[PDB]
């Protein structure tokens, strides 16, 4: 948090490149973005300070692009490209379980599956609070 | 003026919607069991 | 929460309120019918119990067996009717079992069976259902008494528990003894009574058992309908209160959403 | 990539010789918003050539058409436009119509377009999916509530509409069966509220039958798919139209009120339903 | 002024010799937004000196820290920035992080900081009280609904979280008791809707038992405070950890399922609850 | 046009001689928002002339104030001014005040405004209805249920409220009579609910007499109108305040409990009610 907004905006891409190195060399890598909501906030700050017009919830117009061009770099290469892979585990923080918010909906649409963690299940003793009813894997 | 419609209890997904779903499932599980028993008895003939 | 969640909850509670009010009206109609039908049933029950009222027919001493007749209905939403009768029957069972007397219970209401089956499952003699869905009549009571005699449990002492109708809002869970045994029917008062014999008194006692079952059924159905009406009215009032609170919340949320979207549009236009 | 390999192994796309029947135009979410706002135009342009220059019929599958609107919205702010409602571009309806009107059946040829439309937050009142309704003859709304019940496909019976749904077009029998199914499902929705408070066991004997028939119809609407064999494991089915009409008419008539509702879940023709019923009875 | 005089009376601040233990920094609501956006930095700087250049253990009490963000929002409109959500400054998280990450326990010393965070319009989703969650180890979320019921303090047991709430750190018994209390409270809250509409009589016997135990737990969470004695007239109680652990474990077990609900209200140790229950015999 | 011709038929406006009583100021919907924003001021100026240069108790009508607020909002939006909450003009309160404050009682005369109100989204907390209620001194609500009951005028006796309904303003007797009437009507509502649920024999003699008195009152609230004489053929009555108070007081006192219910329907003073009772049998 103390680091400047550009650093927080650039951090997921740095780790993505580090994983891509393994992916293109026949090795398997796992990347965790914790959490992309704060990266979206940092990008919003950068864009607003750059006098770029605000959009929905003051976020820039291309917040969807910001994550889509990042999570689409998580792929499973075939044997012709070494056979490597890069598994991605983005993390999204939802306010009061409002899964229908802007950034959560964008990230859900981008990703292949969702692991819904619910505070109600957490306090009921179900830990990890994985809501298997809504949790899916494409 | 704000109004409502039919079948809005399950749409809210609250306590009453889950209660209704569970009650329907528990009733129709028994009904399916009875129908299966009757069908087996008929098929034995 | 968000606007959509508030709208969904408000619409669900509105539907629940409408259903509760409709059930309140239905219960009011059924209560009126039961109140009309209670008077001849009340006279019939008083006449049936008059003989034991005018004769000191009391159990002499401890008896090995004892049958408890818990009259109740199958429907729920009746408030504390089933709760009160279950508490009364549990207390009576514990008190009579403390004296080392074999206790068996017959419940005409499926709710009584469900409540007592967690603990008093073995003590069930014969369970009946489909009570309260239609107004009770002497045929059902006669069938219940017939299978009670056919159950093979020759209870020397007996009793019946039911919710007597006192008023539209007040009811009493009353216990009435049943001297179904022929020997306990014969006492010092039967000396004055002529043509007592043994078989005639036995048949009379069986018919009196049927009569008290019918009277208890009528009182229980009247009390159940009154309590159903009261509970549905209370549920409707609570639902209306929740409806108005959620309506205020929904108005606040709608205004907030409009203001937020307009502020976003204005900021986007100004930053251009 | 999955679709490309599936069509390669299905013979639809043949690399060895020129017998392929499907063209592919791909602009994915990694592309900048400018690219995603034009791939639909490229695909529909290929379809336009196959429709006009050649008289053959054309199939145009678009997935997902919402990204066109989303890409337009993404570029709108930098293009120098005051944002419209929910942050969309002011020219949303104009550009969407300009794109959609090109995808039409002309006198020269016919293009059958099957467009997948993403509904943000499952809110069909959002402008992007709302404007598309006027551009489509037959609409199929997949709802999350039905999917959570396990009924696949999650098509909403009381929300899907078709212009050809009319007795003068599909026949009296088909229209009657469809309207009866929709009416009984609506009545089931009405009765669910009563069941919530009253309780199912406390319902009358008449409406219990309606609820049972509605459950059977809801389960019989479900159908396994060949493309969905990897998930469910059931064999894919393809029920003919007359078989569907007969099965739903029989269910409406109550001819199968003696079968459990489980027998109608993930089956094809009604004969498969009775076969599953007797198989469950055997165990 | 009240805090200054209380610390003078208690001797924590001495006006005669250099034995005072607490330093005060005050930028209040009467100050212009420029002052209110930097006074927290002044107190933080004093705490930093005491932590680093002397290697001491220091407590940093901040109240209220939301006014820092509010002052930033007030000044950013004039500074010429495109506003963020809810009219806040675009640099809402950057400046907050810069201020907060200085309030940390380094290897030189420890800053045990307690910060009061105002929640505008009782909306925890507001950006200012939402971005500050990530900067806290232990979170205590008061709620107006609980305070309406008279349960003081108004801590929400299903919204307050801590990082040391782990069986390895806090102990297995403590973690088990806390998780059981949270579970029963969540079950009661889930049941609240049916209780609200239909009534208490429609629940199962086990559901009634859970509701009774959860209401007793809600009453027993309330505790009188020494600083609040002048308000309610009840002497403040300072329970130790083991005593409250034992009391809540006993309540969960069911040893006190016969006492009334009011027996657990505004009491300290469970011995006070049992000595209050028999008063209204 | 319909209102113009209806007023012509009623005779409040005459096209032959100078006995007209209404000055019409129409701003139609097809006019620009600026026109509808100043039509109210035009009518208010017409009323101000009568108040000041003639010293009359003028009666101003605005149909309706919500469209005045909407026109003001549209005018402000056209001038590129950032809107307030729920998309209203920043100057909503000030424009409403500048319009309303001219409706007051000067030393020469007075202007009384009867403004129709439309509540958007049926939300009394919206900025326009709230700002309008900030200036209201009384409310008269015409309920469709009362009209279906056959009582004209259809003023709801319960929902209608007046700020000056205070003993210090209207006197002790008037306040007591009005409060008694409202209490009897509320008791009648409760007894009507009971009659709907239970039977009419359930209620006591006191409840039956209260029901009868309340029915007599709610039929006495009906009144023939001079403007409706040509239609219904019933002569209109201008009941003085003293006669109204005396009649309702006597009805509450049970003096006319022997008279039938229809004896008080569509009459003026209570003397006409007793005359109608004499006409019946």
From Swiss-Prot, chain B:
Region (Disordered): 1-17
Location of the protein in the cell: Mitochondrion
Cellular component, GO, one term: mitochondrion
Principal localisation: mitochondrion
Annotated segments matching region N-terminal inhibitory region: 1-21
Presence of keyword DNA damage: no
Entry keywords, A to Z: Coiled coil, Mitochondrion, Transit peptide
Function, as annotated: Endogenous F(1)F(o)-ATPase inhibitor limiting ATP depletion when the mitochondrial membrane potential falls below a threshold and the F(1)F(o)-ATP synthase starts hydrolyzing ATP to pump protons out of the mitochondrial matrix. Required to avoid the consumption of cellular ATP when the F(1)F(o)-ATP synthase enzyme acts as an ATP hydrolase. Indirectly acts as a regulator of heme synthesis in erythroid tissues: regulates heme synthesis by modulating the mitochondrial pH and redox potential, allowing FECH to efficiently catalyze the incorporation of iron into protoporphyrin IX to produce heme.
Family: Belongs to the ATPase inhibitor family.
Quaternary data: Homodimer; represents the active form and is present at a pH value below 6.5. Homotetramer; represents the inactive form and is present at a pH value above 7.0.
Name recorded for this polypeptide: ATPase inhibitor, mitochondrial
Provenance organism: Sus scrofa (Pig)
Gene: ATP5IF1
Residues included from the entire protein: 32 to 76 of 108
